[PDB]
Amino acid sequence: ASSTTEDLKVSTTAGAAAGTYKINVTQLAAAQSLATKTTFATTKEQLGDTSVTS
């Protein structure tokens, strides 16, 4: 398989059919990112309580 664009990459497994396909991409997958609101001072200062052991 060969593509006319470099924004689209194409590979072929075993069993395809010959032809020409006209791809239009409308949206791209994203991933959820969650950030703590309360910025801290150091990456070793304790965050959870020290009363509990697990």
Place this chain on the structure above:
Amino acid sequence: LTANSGTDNTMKITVEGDTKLNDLLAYDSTTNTGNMQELVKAENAKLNVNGID
């Protein structure tokens, strides 16, 4: 089901010996009616070389 390029390669399909499958696979491109929708439309290449079409 995809055919080759050009307008001399439009398909007219029929299923003989079966009825459910014929309800599934049956198209007629002369009248543009059948049991199968048409995603792509056949065309010919048109170009112009030194003023000859």
